[PDB]
Design a protein around this ligand. Structure first.
Ligand SMILES: CC(=O)SCCNC(=O)CCNC(=O)[C@@H](O)C(C)(C)COP(=O)(O)OP(=O)(O)OC[C@@H]1O[C@@H](n2cnc3c(N)ncnc32)[C@H](O)[C@@H]1OP(=O)(O)O
Lengths: 133, 133
């Protein structure tokens, strides 16, 4: 990949990406504005950086999110399309970090940075099986 | 709220809180390890700061997350119990800033800062309604 490479990714927000759908088990979230949850916005931004990454993964490799630092500056109702935009700002071994921005057609809805770690799925799957109680 | 308010919030990670359940739409996420997604973690960290400001909100008040900045430094299969510790670190007007950090009983899984904005719910819900195409 090349520091400075950009990428872009679109998502029509359905009504089930609101706060209370992120955690159906939260009494508190049950009464939030029916707006796009910060958790999902995270997931989407990761999703974009995952997409950009894919053609460059070798067999048996994968990646994990290792840092997410974004603001969330407008709320996005269902029906809007969120456009995530993802520029590569660094590679340092297996560690890649991006800029992400998102908007919904109407407003700038947040931006910041995301870091991922390229992993070897077998080794990581085994550590995970090890702490599975 | 005064600075120093610490909550401590506890969650048994079920199998529907892994990467592929954050975005059932994503084929890329579909073949990820079954571990606790960064977005679901974000939503837990948030959930804790919310629980914690519930005593201090007037009737008709609510809140939204306005910034999230965390690491995700170890990984969590379903069946473990994640313990967020939200701590309140700045209060200025409608804006509260909280440290979150999260532990699954084996590893510290992620930490950093989260910002929320206190809002008026009926008023904010009309605005959302207006913006919803
Ligand atoms: C953590 C979660 O799951 S929820 C996160 C999902 N949504 C968000 O985080 C929202 C992102 N942030 C916001 O919407 C915030 O910027 C707040 C929290 C809306 C801050 O915006 P503010 O302009 O300070 O006003 P606030 O929403 O508190 O008050 C209600 C109204 O929104 C204001 N508003 C201004 N711009 C916008 C906008 N782009 N989107 C929504 N509301 C807006 C209105 O002027 C009105 O303000 P008033 O109370 O002074 O009349």
């Amino acid at each position: 990949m090349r520091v400075g490479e950009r990428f872009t990714h679109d998502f029509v927000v359905p009504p089930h990406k609101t706060v209370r759908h992120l955690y159906p088990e939260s009494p508190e979230f049950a009464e939030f504005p029916e707006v796009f949850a910060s958790g999902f916005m995270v997931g989407l931004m990761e999703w974009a950086c995952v997409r950009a990454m894919a053609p460059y993964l070798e067999p048996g490799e994968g990646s994990l999110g290792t840092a997410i630092c974004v603001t969330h500056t407008a709320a996005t109702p269902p029906g809007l399309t969120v456009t995530v935009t993802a520029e590569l700002r660094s590679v340092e071994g297996r560690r890649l970090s991006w800029r992400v921005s998102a908007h919904d057609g109407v407003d700038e809805i947040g931006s910041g940075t995301h870091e991922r770690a390229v992993i070897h799925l077998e080794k990581f799957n085994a550590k995970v099986r090890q702490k599975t109680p």
